[PDB]
Amino acid sequence: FIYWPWADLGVPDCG
Amino acid sequence: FIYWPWAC
Amino acid sequence: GPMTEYKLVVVGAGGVGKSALTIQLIQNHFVDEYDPTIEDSYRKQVVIDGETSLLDILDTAGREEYSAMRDQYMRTGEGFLLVFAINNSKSFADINLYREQIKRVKDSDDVPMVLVGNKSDLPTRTVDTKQAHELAKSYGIPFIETSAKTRQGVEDAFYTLVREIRQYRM
Numbered sequence: 001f002i003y004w005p006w007a008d009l010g011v012p013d014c015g
Numbered sequence: 016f017i018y019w020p021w022a023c
Numbered sequence: 024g025p026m027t028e029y030k031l032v033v034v035g036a037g038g039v040g041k042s043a044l045t046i047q048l049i050q051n052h053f054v055d056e057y058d059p060t061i062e063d064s065y066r067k068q069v070v071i072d073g074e075t076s077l078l079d080i081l082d083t084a085g086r087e088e089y090s091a092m093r094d095q096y097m098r099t100g101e102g103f104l105l106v107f108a109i110n111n112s113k114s115f116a117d118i119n120l121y122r123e124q125i126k127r128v129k130d131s132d133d134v135p136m137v138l139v140g141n142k143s144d145l146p147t148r149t150v151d152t153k154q155a156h157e158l159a160k161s162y163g164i165p166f167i168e169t170s171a172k173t174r175q176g177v178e179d180a181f182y183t184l185v186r187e188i189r190q191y192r193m
């Protein structure tokens with residue numbers, strides 16, 4: 001559920 | 016530890 | 024020392040789910056009724072990445088008529104959850120006003136903040152994930168999609184904010 005400022009647009013980090 | 020944080 | 028302390032403030036337009044997110048964090052319960060807030064405060068001890076922390080959380084009013092109380096909680100608060108509801112495009116547009124007032128009151132461009140898109144359990148939405156992620160990127164902050172109803176992302180939103188303040192202090 002987390003969308004970091006450096007992540008691809010609309011791709012969440014679930015790790 | 017603060018006794019009243021909104022006021023160690 | 025033994026414990027650390029963090030002053031968190033939950034802000035955003037009326038009815039987006041600030042109280043429901045806070046109560047899901049603190050009581051492990053979903054509030055179905057809408058009881059509009061004036062200003063409530065909670066203190067809850069948690070362990071985040073091995074750090075015993077006391078979270079002082081201020082649950083603020085979204086209703087416009089309580090806007091004169093903002094300056095005080097903005098000066099005191101160490102980190103802010105900017106909450107909007109994914110089926111309420113007006114609440115998403117209101118996020119900028121909150122970020123701008125925090126910036127002005129604290130005279131800082133790096134105040135710890137997290138953008139929260141709540142009500143992710145809904146079957147339809149009016150604010151795209153990409154649109155909210157794009158805004159959070161323009162601010163240099165994380166964006167978290169939450170559901171106070173299912174508890175999805177709730178600890179993620181509050182704990183990401185605590186981690187940002189912890190890093191800010193260093």
Ligand SMILES: Nc1nc2c(ncn2[C@@H]2O[C@H](COP(=O)(O)OP(=O)(O)OP(=O)(O)O)[C@@H](O)[C@H]2O)c(=O)[nH]1
Nearest residue numbers: 037038039040041042043055060085142170171172
């Ligand atoms: N489906 C769904 N409803 C939610 C969610 N979060 C909150 N709600 C509902 O939205 C309504 C308003 O939630 P509150 O948390 O009271 O809203 P608020 O942002 O605190 O409002 P104010 O205190 O007036 O600023 C209630 O009926 C909640 O049950 C969620 O994640 N999913």
Ligand SMILES: [Mg+2]
Nearest residue numbers: 041042059060
């Ligand atoms: Mg409320």
